[PDB]
Design a binder for this molecule. Structure first.
Ligand SMILES: N[C@@H](CCCC(=O)N[C@@H](CS)C(=O)NCC(=O)O)C(=O)O
Ligand SMILES: [Fe+2]
Length: 329
């Protein structure tokens, strides 16, 4: 009785090459998906996702409680005042099932100018001990650059789809400064599954995480093959089918702002499923000072009555609001 959502599979391959015509055909597909339910799967993206889930499972399953406190964000561990974003997000057995590990740009090192200035939302990543987790940091840092690569190609597709030159977004999405992050989220199988860890939607649907719009320009998501996501449409909440060979793509509210809502940030929520699974989002965030002037591809002159908003401001307020609305993850 819940209908299936329209989530097209788009071969994003041409976005890596120089066939400008082929790129326009991919852009049209992005345009259609963005104006409809606001989700699509990127296929032929070139990333080894099987290796990704394997390396990630090895980490989630071998990290100990000790290590988690030692890596924990400030919300779980008051000693770690600089860890607002990056580090470990603990489960609370009996109360909160989900747990995760977030890391930012590998280039945010101690000598980075934004780290030196202590600019909000910039942090140096924390990692487990190499001997307990051999290869993990290097795997994870490589993965950041692989998915960064996929996201630049996708940003060229969205730029072309909106009537712009292909670097419109991508020129603000740079290795030395992107606020992009990876979150390795573990959703556990639990028996018994704690009721306090299950939320209930107004329509009676059991959830693991409530309705929201994403805090990003776009979101580039790998998940396990366990159906869980629902997107709200004019026909109501519809199920997004799982596909663990592709990346699920959608826009965040930053894109909605820029396009004066021509590409909406789709409202979605995460159904409660009692299954051991992974949700591995890459939040495509720009630079702290990145400002794109808002426009409207539905108006003849392209003008919008929205004001410019720097990415850093959007991100910092956005992530705080998401915590307040939907709880500390
Ligand atoms: N710490 C991250 C941002 C994490 C944002 C977040 O909490 N996303 C929610 C909604 S997209 C989540 O993904 N909830 C669950 C789920 O399965 O999606 C980094 O600093 O940028
Ligand atoms: Fe989301």
């Amino acid at each position: 009785s819940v209908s299936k959502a329209n989530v097209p599979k788009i071969d994003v391959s041409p976005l890596f090459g120089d066939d400008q015509a082929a790129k326009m055909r991919v852009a049209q597909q992005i345009d259609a998906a963005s104006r409809d339910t606001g989700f699509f799967y990127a296929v032929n993206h070139g990333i080894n996702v099987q290796r990704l889930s394997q390396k990630t499972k090895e980490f989630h399953m071998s990290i100990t409680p000790e290590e988690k406190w030692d890596l924990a964000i400030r919300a779980y561990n008051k000693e770690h005042q600089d860890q607002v974003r990056a580090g470990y997000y603990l489960s609370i057995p009996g109360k909160k099932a989900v747990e995760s590990f977030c890391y930012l740009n590998p280039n945010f090192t101690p000598d980075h100018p934004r780290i030196q200035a202590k600019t909000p939302t910039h942090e140096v990543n924390v990692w487990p001990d190499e001997t307990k987790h051999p290869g993990f940091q290097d795997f994870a840092e490589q993965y950041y650059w692989d998915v960064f690569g996929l996201s630049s190609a996708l940003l060229k597709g969205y730029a072309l789809a909106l009537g712009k030159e292909e670097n419109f977004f991508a020129r603000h999405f740079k290795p030395d400064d992107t606020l992009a992050s990876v979150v390795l989220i573990r959703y556990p199988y639990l028996d018994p599954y704690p009721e306090a860890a299950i939320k209930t939607a107004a329509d009676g649907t059991k959830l693991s995480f409530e309705w929201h719009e994403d805090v990003s320009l776009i979101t580039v998501l790998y998940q396990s093959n366990v159906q869980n996501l629902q997107v709200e449409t004019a026909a109501g909440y519809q199920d997004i089918e799982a596909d663990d060979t592709g990346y699920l793509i959608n826009c965040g509210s930053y894109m909605a702002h820029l396009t004066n809502n021509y590409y909406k940030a789709p409202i979605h929520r995460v159904k409660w499923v009692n299954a051991e699974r992974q949700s591995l989002p890459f939040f495509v965030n720009l630079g702290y000072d990145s400002v794109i002037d808002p426009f409207d591809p539905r108006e003849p002159n392209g003008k919008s009555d929205r004001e410019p908003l720097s990415y850093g401001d959007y991100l910092q307020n956005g992530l705080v609001s998401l915590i307040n609305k939907n709880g500390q993850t």
